[PDB]
Amino acid sequence: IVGGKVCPKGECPWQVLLLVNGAQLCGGTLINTIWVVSAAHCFDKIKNWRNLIAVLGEHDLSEHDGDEQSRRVAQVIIPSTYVPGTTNHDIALLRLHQPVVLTDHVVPLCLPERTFSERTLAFVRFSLVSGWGQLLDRGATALELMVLNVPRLMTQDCLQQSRKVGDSPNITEYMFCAGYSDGSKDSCKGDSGGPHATHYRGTWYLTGIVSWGQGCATVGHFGVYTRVSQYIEWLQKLMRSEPRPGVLLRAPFP
Amino acid sequence: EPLYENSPEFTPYLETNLGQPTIQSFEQVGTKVNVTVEDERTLVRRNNTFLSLRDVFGKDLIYTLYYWSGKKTAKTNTNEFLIDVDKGENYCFSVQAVIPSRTVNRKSTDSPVECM
Amino acid sequence: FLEELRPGSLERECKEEQCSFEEAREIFKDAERTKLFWISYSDGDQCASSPCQNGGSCKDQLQSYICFCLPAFEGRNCETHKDDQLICVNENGGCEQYCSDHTGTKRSCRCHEGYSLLADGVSCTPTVEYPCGKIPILE
Amino acid sequence: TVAAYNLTWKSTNFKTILEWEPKPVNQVYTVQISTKSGDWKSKCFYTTDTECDLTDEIVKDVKQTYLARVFSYPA
Ligand SMILES: CC(C)CNC(=O)c1ccc(Oc2nc(Oc3cccc(C(=N)N)c3)c(F)c(N(C(C)C)C(C)C)c2F)c(C(=O)O)c1
Ligand SMILES: *[C@@H]1O[C@H](CO)[C@@H](O)[C@H](O)[C@H]1NC(C)=O
Ligand SMILES: OC[C@H]1O[C@H](O)[C@H](O)[C@@H](O)[C@@H]1O
Ligand SMILES: C[C@@H]1O[C@@H](O)[C@@H](O)[C@H](O)[C@@H]1O
Ligand SMILES: [Ca+2]
Ligand SMILES: [Ca+2]
Ligand SMILES: [Ca+2]
Ligand SMILES: [Ca+2]
Ligand SMILES: [Ca+2]
Numbered sequence: 285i286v287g288g289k290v291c292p293k294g295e296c297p298w299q300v301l302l303l304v305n306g307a308q309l310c311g312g313t314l315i316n317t318i319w320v321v322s323a324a325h326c327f328d329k330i331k332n333w334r335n336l337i338a339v340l341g342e343h344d345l346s347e348h349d350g351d352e353q354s355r356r357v358a359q360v361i362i363p364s365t366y367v368p369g370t371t372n373h374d375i376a377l378l379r380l381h382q383p384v385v386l387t388d389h390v391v392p393l394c395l396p397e398r399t400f401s402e403r404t405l406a407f408v409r410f411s412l413v414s415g416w417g418q419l420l421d422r423g424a425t426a427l428e429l430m431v432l433n434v435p436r437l438m439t440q441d442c443l444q445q446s447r448k449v450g451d452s453p454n455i456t457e458y459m460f461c462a463g464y465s466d467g468s469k470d471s472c473k474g475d476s477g478g479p480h481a482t483h484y485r486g487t488w489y490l491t492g493i494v495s496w497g498q499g500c501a502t503v504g505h506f507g508v509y510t511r512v513s514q515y516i517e518w519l520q521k522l523m524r525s526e527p528r529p530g531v532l533l534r535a536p537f538p
Numbered sequence: 539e540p541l542y543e544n545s546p547e548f549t550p551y552l553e554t555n556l557g558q559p560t561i562q563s564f565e566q567v568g569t570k571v572n573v574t575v576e577d578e579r580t581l582v583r584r585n586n587t588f589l590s591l592r593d594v595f596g597k598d599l600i601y602t603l604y605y606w607s608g609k610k611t612a613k614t615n616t617n618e619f620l621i622d623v624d625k626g627e628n629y630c631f632s633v634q635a636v637i638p639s640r641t642v643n644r645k646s647t648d649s650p651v652e653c654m
Numbered sequence: 655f656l657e658e659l660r661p662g663s664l665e666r667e668c669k670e671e672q673c674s675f676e677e678a679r680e681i682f683k684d685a686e687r688t689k690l691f692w693i694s695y696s697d698g699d700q701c702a703s704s705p706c707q708n709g710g711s712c713k714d715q716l717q718s719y720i721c722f723c724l725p726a727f728e729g730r731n732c733e734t735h736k737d738d739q740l741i742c743v744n745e746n747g748g749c750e751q752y753c754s755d756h757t758g759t760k761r762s763c764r765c766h767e768g769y770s771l772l773a774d775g776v777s778c779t780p781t782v783e784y785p786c787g788k789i790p791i792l793e
Numbered sequence: 794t795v796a797a798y799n800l801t802w803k804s805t806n807f808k809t810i811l812e813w814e815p816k817p818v819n820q821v822y823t824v825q826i827s828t829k830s831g832d833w834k835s836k837c838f839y840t841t842d843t844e845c846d847l848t849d850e851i852v853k854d855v856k857q858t859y860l861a862r863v864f865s866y867p868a
Contacts, residue, residue, distance in 0.1 A: 294791040315786070386784035394766050394786035397752055404746045404753075407825070407833040435830070438539050457539075485750045487766070487778075487787035542864040545800035545811055550855040554804040558694075558715050579713070579722065581807040582852045588722060591806065594855065606687060630682075632690055647716050650694035651687070653664055720808045729846045730810055743823070743835055 285415055286501040287469035288432030293343040294351070296414050296429055298393035298479060298488075301339040302357075305332055308425065311415040311478030313490055314340060314392045317383035319523050321395070322376045322477035323493050323510065324362040328369065333360070333531035338380055341389040345416060345427045351389035356381040361522055363515075363537035371453045373537065374495045374510045376477070377522055393481055395520075396489040401513040404484065405491050409435050411462065411482040413494055413507070417474025421500040425474050432469055434462040434480075437506065447504025453496070458514050460492065461506035470507045472500035480509045556591065556635040556646035559601065564631060564652060566623075573619040575601050575633050575649075591635060592617060598639055604632045604648065628654045668695065707732045751778045794820050797843075797863040809851050811861050812844045819868045826850050826861040839866065 291299070300312030300320050310326035320338055330336070336357035343351070359379035366373040384390055396405060414431040418424065437445070442461035455461065462480060463470050471478070471494045480492025492509030499505070518537055525535075562576040578591040591599055603612040603619045606629065612619050623629055630653035635646035660666065664681050667673045675692055682688040694716070701712035706721035710732035713720045723732035742753035742761055749763035756762060765771050765778035768785040772778065784790065797813040804810070811824060824845040825833040837845035851859055 295789055297789060388790040391784050391788065391790060392786045396766070399742075400746075400752050403743055407835075409827070409830060409832050438542070440539070440542065441544075485746075487751060487785075488789070489787060540864045540866055541794050541796040542862050543797045543800055543813070545813075545861040545863070546802065547858050547860055548802045548804070548809070548851070549858045550804065550807055550809065550851045553802070554807050554809065554855075557713070557720065557806040578806060581720075581722065581809075581848050582855060586725070594807075604690070607684070609686075630687065630691075648690060648693065651691040715805065718805075720805055722808075728849050730808075730844065734846065739838070741838065743838055745834065 285413070285417060285426065285430035285432050285470075285475055286420060286472050288414075288430045291343075291414055291429045291431035293429075294389045296412075296431055297341075297389055297391035298481070298490075299342070299414055299429060300477075301342045301345075301416065302326065302477060303337040303339065304330060305335040306337075308345070308416065308474065310474070310476045311417070311494060312338060312378065313477075313479035313481075313493070314384070314390070315395045315490060316392050316523075317386065318380045320357075320378040320380065321479075321490060321493060321512070321519070322378060323374045323495055324366045324376045325368070325371075325374050325495070326477045327360055327362065327376060327532070330360075330532075336360070336378075336531070338378065340384050341387065343429050351387065353384045353390060355384055358531070359527060359533060360531055361525075361533045361535050363518070364534040365537045366534075371459070371496050371508070372456050373458055375493055375512070375515055377519055379527070393479055393488055393490045395512075395516065396491070398513050398516040401489070401491060401516070405482045405489055406436070406460075406513070408482050408484055411436060411480050411491060413462070413471045413475065413478065413480045413492075413509075415471065415475030415478040415494060417476070417478075417494075418472040418500065421472060421502075432471065434464070434469065434471075434507065436460060436462045442506055445504075446506065449498055449505075452498060453508075455508060458511050459495065459508050460511045461508055462492065463497075463507040464501070465504050465506055467501050467503040470497060470501035472497075480512075551594075552640065553643060555643060556637065558647045559633050559635050559649040561631060561633055561649055561652045562617075564654065566654070567620075569622060569625060571619075571621050571623050571629065571654075573603055573605075573621070573631055573633070575617040575619075577617060578635060595637060598637050600636050600638060602634045602636050602645075604634070605629050630654070705731045708735070749776050794865045794867050796865055797822065800861070800863060807848065807852055807855060808846075809848045810844055810846050811863075813863055814843060816843055817841050817865075817868075820865050821868050823864045823866065824861055825864070826859055828854075828857045828859055 302309045312320040312322035340353045341351040358381040361377040363373040475494040478494040482491045497507040560576040562574040564573045582589040633649040679688040700719040706712040708727045711722040728734045747753040747761040752764040763776045769778040800813045821839040827833040
């Protein structure tokens with residue numbers, strides 16, 4: 285996260301830390317006691333699918349306290365339409381081997397209904413994005429969870445307000461831009477998979493997933509997030525699916 | 539997302555047009571004339587009641603009087619003018635709402651003309 | 655023609671009766687003042703047709719008017735009934751969480767799992783200790 | 794669908810109406826208005842009119858700067 289603030293311990297309770305063989309990999313969002321939503325591109329180079337751990341109640345990566353809960357990732361589901369190395373359909377649904385226990389420090393973010401998300405949440409200007417990612421594009425990562433308030437843009441505006449770049453990825457219907465183009469604030473590498481959470485009439489909902497951008501907080505550019513509303517049905521169905529043998533599962537989409 | 543178009547930015551206080559005023563009355567008082575401008579009602583509400591242009595703009599709003607061979611002008615921080623006139627002579631009046639601090643759209647259209 | 659013996663009079667010629675430009679000009683004896691008078695005099699009262707609906711008030715302007723509406727109405731001519739705008743696209747239909755439109759009748763409100771719709775038909779309250787989307791340490 | 798154009802603000806004594814073109818043919822409009830940092834509020838839902846009274850929204854704070862947008866939806 286570039287230009288954000290430390291999320292006071294316990295105030296970003298749905299934030300998930302994903303580890304691969306004990307090393308920091310990506311972020312994620314808890315939506316219930318056993319399912320976590322993350323980004324598909326976070327698993328492009330995974331080889332040891334059996335060494336995937338999800339940590340809840342985490343805050344300071346340098347100290348362990350009694351609020352932290354760890355669970356093995358039993359399954360990783362990604363849209364078969366996703367193409368490693370690219371940006372479209374950047375979403376992953378993770379099934380934990382054992383459910384976490386909800387506490388004052390571990391709470392799931394609400395996965396909203398599609399229409400509610402498209403007609404109402406999409407028009408709340410600001411939302412929170414968070415993670416232990418890089419504090420500057422090529423800089424160091426954060427030890428304490430960081431959070432940032434970013435304003436959302438309809439894609440037409442995003443395109444008209446962004447500096448034209450040669451081989452830049454298209455902003456599809458499965459994405460949306462949020463942030464600032466003045467080079468001051470943005471999500472960044474490592475934050476990938478984390479939540480873009482929207483507050484509406486007293487409750488917080490999952491509206492986006494930290495996905496990509498052109499260099500963190502680069503002038504003339506906004507951060508790009510996976511448009512979760514397009515995957516509500518897809519996610520709900522899969523969460524009712526039966527456990528497969530292998531870890532990785534490329535499920536059909538729609 | 540649907541196709542759409544953005545409008546220009548709009549700041550009400552600085553851009554809404556000032557309505558055409560109406561001279562409420564003009565009474566001769568000795569060697570002077572008291573010209574009163576009717577309170578211009580606006581769409582801004584406040585407890586089942588509409589605020590006047592005066593209530594909204596306060597000191598930013600003034601009214602200008604055009605009366606009369608050349609013409610003379612008078613200005614007021616309220617909604618009333620008290621001008622010196624020559625007895626036996628007939629005068630005509632017209633008023634205009636003005637927000638001097640503006641650079642564009644600073645004045646309303648002139649009110650209907652009223653003569654003695 | 656016996657009326658035309660009475661000396662010029664703005665009051666009798668233009669205020670009581672209707673007068674022409676030159677008639678008015680012959681009174682003001684000056685293009686500038688005459689036109690200033692004419693601008694409004696010949697403009698007409700756009701409020702004549704009573705454009706403001708649902709009990710609104712009309713205020714004439716130059717070649718236009720303004721409608722002041724009662725609290726429950728809006729629109730150029732107060733034609734919009736605020737009471738008929740209770741639909742999900744309008745501020746979520748007043749629903750705290752989910753909104754469902756129902757053509758023919760009225761919209762209903764619903765809640766996310768872990769919550770239950772209250773009596774008011776629009777608010778939602780937790781049915782579990784840790785409902786989704788709430789921050790315990792701040793609650 | 795065709796995007797609206799020539800969006801113009803018509804405002805006198807705060808009675809504020811947004812106007813635009815073109816008259817619709819097999820499409821309807823919905824307008825949204827907001828302040829630079831506030832949420833978008835919808836008005837004139839699925840209208841075939843080419844105007845939208847926004848008075849009630851702008852009088853909430855006449856000193857704020859508002860931006861409106863007109864959406865086109867296929868009928
Ligand atoms: C220890 C950890 C913090 C590891 N961090 C690292 O060193 C690290 C190195 C590289 C890396 O890959 C990577 N990082 C990107 O930056 C990001 C990722 C997420 C958000 C933004 C933003 N500006 N809001 C930028 C990418 F936009 C892409 N693309 C893809 C295709 C979406 C572009 C479009 C090519 C990408 F692959 C990540 C990551 O994915 O988070 C992390
Ligand atoms: C002028 O007329 C107004 C309107 O009645 C009145 O309130 C005010 O006291 C008068 N002042 C003068 C100059 O006599
Ligand atoms: O009834 C609608 C009409 O009312 C009045 O005639 C107005 O002058 C006119 O502008 C409006 O179109
Ligand atoms: C807003 C309207 O204003 C005038 O038209 C009054 O005569 C009406 O009763 C109404 O209050
Ligand atoms: Ca820790
Ligand atoms: Ca005559
Ligand atoms: Ca008479
Ligand atoms: Ca003549
Ligand atoms: Ca008129």
